[PDB]
From a paper:
The plant protease inhibitor EcTI from Enterobobium contortisiliquum is a classical trypsin inhibitor belonging to the Kunitz family. A Kunitz-type inhibitor that was first isolated from Enterolobium contortisiliquum was named EcTI. It was shown that EcTI inhibits trypsin, chymotrypsin, plasma kallikrein, plasmin, human neutrophil elastase, and Factor XIIa in the stoichiometric ratio 1∶1, but not thrombin, bovine pancreatic elastase, or Factor Xa. The fold of EcTI is a β-trefoil, typical for the STI-related family of Kunitz inhibitors. As found in most known Kunitz-type inhibitors, EcTI has a single reactive site located on loop L5, between β-strands 4 and 5.
Numbering used by the authors:
A (entry chain B): 16 to 34, 37 to 67, 69 to 125, 127 to 130, 132 to 183, 184A, 184 to 187, 188A, ...
B (entry chain A): 1 to 110, 114 to 134, 141 to 174
């Protein structure tokens, strides 16, 4: 996160880390056994970290659980980034407390102007790299579709939305992929992509979760 | 396989690196130069001097994953420290493959993904251009300038060194 702040311990209990030696993405815990993340975050043998705040610290409520199924959307296009969503099944049910907890899927789509909390351990610079020891947060309004397509002409599908600031200075960044966009307590988005980080008229682009609630619930029931 | 720097760390998405020859004896890092009639250093070349690291490159891809893999289509651009007056007010210095010459140039005045990939090559790595994928190598002009061009079957073997830390 660029231009954000320290979330603090246990404020974002649904935020998970995806690891394979290194942190490469984030994701969101939607029940004790299932995480939502980005489809371009896929790789075999993902280790999931729950209850994390400080990455240099092994916290007590921290949980380290390997994925047992990493299910990419049937229609994920690696070339357009359309349908950039993935479901990860944890090898065993995680322990739910105040440091580890779920986030609700939405019943309906969020509207433009809605303030959302986006979080990650990703890069905090717009040029060159700087990773935080602690989780970073940012509040960001959801932008209208018209603004979003003006920023990214021909590149915004029906399953993407823009959030952030057209002036720049505040945005998600590299390392934040898969991480939550939470608006009014619902999981409305997934960190997906952008052109650079926090650059003017180039807001972050996010996977529109509300279009996938059916697929998510169906996939969970069948696995 | 995976992409590693000289410190044996996986390459970071959005990271800045020097791009150095994997072997040694001929040339140093990648940098900018003028060739032919251009009045401003727009050609990506390899430094003639072995001791020179050149100009560091930002290598990134639009999805906001933390790392880079051989699979990812890459945007590559030189960093903008201490530039000539000619380039001085440009934000980014992206690489673009240009002309019938298929030379790698910076295109300061201008699709979803980039046209480059990094691929393993023996015990190091090579840069490929995907219009499919062709190795980038060095073509030495008649003034001994060491131009990075599209050059299938003859890749320049590179290794990545962090510019910071």
């Amino acid at each position: 996160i660029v231009g954000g702040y320290t979330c603090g311990a246990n404020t974002v209990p649904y935020q998970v880390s995806l690891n394979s030696g290194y942190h490469f993405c984030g994701g969101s815990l939607i029940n004790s056994q299932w995480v939502v993340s980005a489809a371009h975050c896929y790789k075999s043998g993902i280790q999931v970290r729950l209850g994390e705040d400080n990455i240099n610290v092994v916290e007590g409520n921290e949980q380290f659980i390997s994925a047992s199924k990493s299910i990419v959307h049937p229609s994920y296009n690696s070339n357009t980034l359309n349908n950039d969503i993935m479901l990860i099944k944890l090898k065993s049910a995680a322990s739910l407390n105040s440091r580890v907890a779920s986030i609700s899927l939405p019943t309906s789509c969020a509207s433009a102007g809605t303030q959302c909390l986006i979080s990650g351990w990703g890069n905090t610079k717009s040029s060159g790299t700087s990773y935080p020891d602690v989780l970073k947060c940012l509040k960001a309004p959801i932008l209208s579709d018209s603004s979003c397509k003006s920023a990214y002409p021909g590149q915004i599908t029906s399953n993407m939305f823009c959030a952030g600031y057209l002036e720049g200075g505040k945005d998600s960044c590299q390392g934040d992929s898969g991480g939550p966009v939470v608006c009014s307590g619902k999981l409305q988005g997934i960190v997906s992509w952008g052109s650079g980080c926090a650059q003017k008229n180039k807001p972050g682009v996010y996977t529109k979760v509300c279009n996938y609630v059916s697929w998510i619930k169906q996939t969970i029931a069948s696995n | 396989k995976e992409l590693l720097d000289s410190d044996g760390d996986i390459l970071r998405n959005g990271g800045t690196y020097y791009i150095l020859p994997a072997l040694r004896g001929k040339g140093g890092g990648l940098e900018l130069a003028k060739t032919g009639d251009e009045t401003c250093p727009l050609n990506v070349v390899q430094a003639r001097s072995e001791t020179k690291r050149g100009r560091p490159a930002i290598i990134w891809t639009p999805p906001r994953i933390a790392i880079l893999t051989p699979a990812f289509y890459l945007n590559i651009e030189f960093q903008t420290r201490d530039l000539p007056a000619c380039l001085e007010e440009y934000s980014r210095l992206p690489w673009k493959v240009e002309g019938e010459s298929q030379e790698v140039k910076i295109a300061p005045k201008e699709h979803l993904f980039g046209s480059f990939k990094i691929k393993p090559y023996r015990d190091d790595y090579k840069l490929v251009y995907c219009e499919s994928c062709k190795d980038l190598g060095i073509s030495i002009d008649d003034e001994n300038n060491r131009l990075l061009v599209v050059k299938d079957g003859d890749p320049l073997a590179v290794r990545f060194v962090k510019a910071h830390r």
